[PDB]
Amino acid sequence: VPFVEDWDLVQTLGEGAYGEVQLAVNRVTEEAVAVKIVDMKRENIKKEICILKMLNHENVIKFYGHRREGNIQYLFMELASGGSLFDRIEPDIGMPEPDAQRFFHQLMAGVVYLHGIGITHRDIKPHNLLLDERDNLKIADYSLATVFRYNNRERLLNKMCGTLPYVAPELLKRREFHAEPVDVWSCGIVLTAMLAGELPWDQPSDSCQEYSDWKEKKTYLNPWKKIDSAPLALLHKILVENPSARITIPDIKKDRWYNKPLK
Numbered sequence: 001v002p003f004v005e006d007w008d009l010v011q012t013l014g015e016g017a018y019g020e021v022q023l024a025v026n027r028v029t030e031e032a033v034a035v036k037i038v039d040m041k042r043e044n045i046k047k048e049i050c051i052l053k054m055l056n057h058e059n060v061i062k063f064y065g066h067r068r069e070g071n072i073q074y075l076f077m078e079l080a081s082g083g084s085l086f087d088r089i090e091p092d093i094g095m096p097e098p099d100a101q102r103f104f105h106q107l108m109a110g111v112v113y114l115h116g117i118g119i120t121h122r123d124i125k126p127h128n129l130l131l132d133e134r135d136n137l138k139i140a141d142y143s144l145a146t147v148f149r150y151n152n153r154e155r156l157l158n159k160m161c162g163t164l165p166y167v168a169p170e171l172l173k174r175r176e177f178h179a180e181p182v183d184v185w186s187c188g189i190v191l192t193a194m195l196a197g198e199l200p201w202d203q204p205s206d207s208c209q210e211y212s213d214w215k216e217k218k219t220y221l222n223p224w225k226k227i228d229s230a231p232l233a234l235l236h237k238i239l240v241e242n243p244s245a246r247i248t249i250p251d252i253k254k255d256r257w258y259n260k261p262l263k
């Protein structure tokens with residue numbers, strides 16, 4: 001069992017490009033945390049750490065601190081012992097609408113927070129939405145995150161990143177684009193996944209027939225026919241091709257389904 005000072009690395013929680021995340025248990029105190037390990041031999045991590053140190057909100061993963069030990073960086077974060085939203089989505093089914101609604105509220109709270117400190121996540125998807133012991137959602141993984149507002153001045157993005165089934169269509173079609181509507185779009189694909197247990201398209205290019213079908217309002221197809229009319233009216237306002245016409249988070253919060261009592 002590997003270790004870092006007082007911590008035993010006791011279980012793999014993920015292993016992408018950026019090394020691994022380990023469940024770390026302090027041998028003295030028995031405190032459990034998550035540790036991201038990056039082998040710097042294999043600028044970006046300077047940025048990630050700077051962003052992580054800004055984050056203070058109940059629906060965003062907390063940063064405890066980092067240790068360099070040669071080429072290895074250790075990033076200590078809050079453990080979400082519930083695991084991911086990904087694992088609460090039953091393929092082809094989704095989850096009960098009240099659970100989807102609660103998670104969507106928490107995801108909006110997290111995203112409003114990040115946007116309000118001028119940070120865009122840029123890869124919102126169920127893999128990056130983690131659950132604490134009380135099933136409170138946490139936005140995780142700030143490795144693609146970036147500043148879109150500084151000194152109250154917005155900067156457009158030009159870098160293409162994210163995950164194709166979650167990316168907004170402007171990110172495939174425009175030289176430059178606003179950060180906020182991209183994160184809103186991916187929230188709408190997450191909501192679709194939660195209510196239908198299915199992603200609607202490989203990517204929103206109109207070389208993609210499922211995306212054309214949606215633009216032509218063919219909601220008698222999957223995944224849309226699994227979704228009640230109320231949450232579907234919200235998805236009609238989120239999954240809008242023109243990012244200037246797309247609903248903003250203030251207006252999501254006035255949506256009928258958003259405010260519908262459910263249990």
Ligand SMILES: CNc1nc(Nc2cn(C(C)(C)C#N)nc2C)ncc1C(F)(F)F
Pocket residue numbers: 012013014021034035036061077078079080081082083084087130140141
């Ligand atoms: C993957 N990163 C993180 N993971 C957790 N918790 C957690 C993830 N899993 C999955 C299902 C992915 C597995 N294996 N299971 C648990 C208990 N907490 C925090 C992080 C963090 F901070 F590094 F994002």
Ligand SMILES: [Cl-]
Pocket residue numbers: 091
């Ligand atoms: Cl699947």
Ligand SMILES: [Cl-]
Pocket residue numbers: 089193197198199
């Ligand atoms: Cl899914």
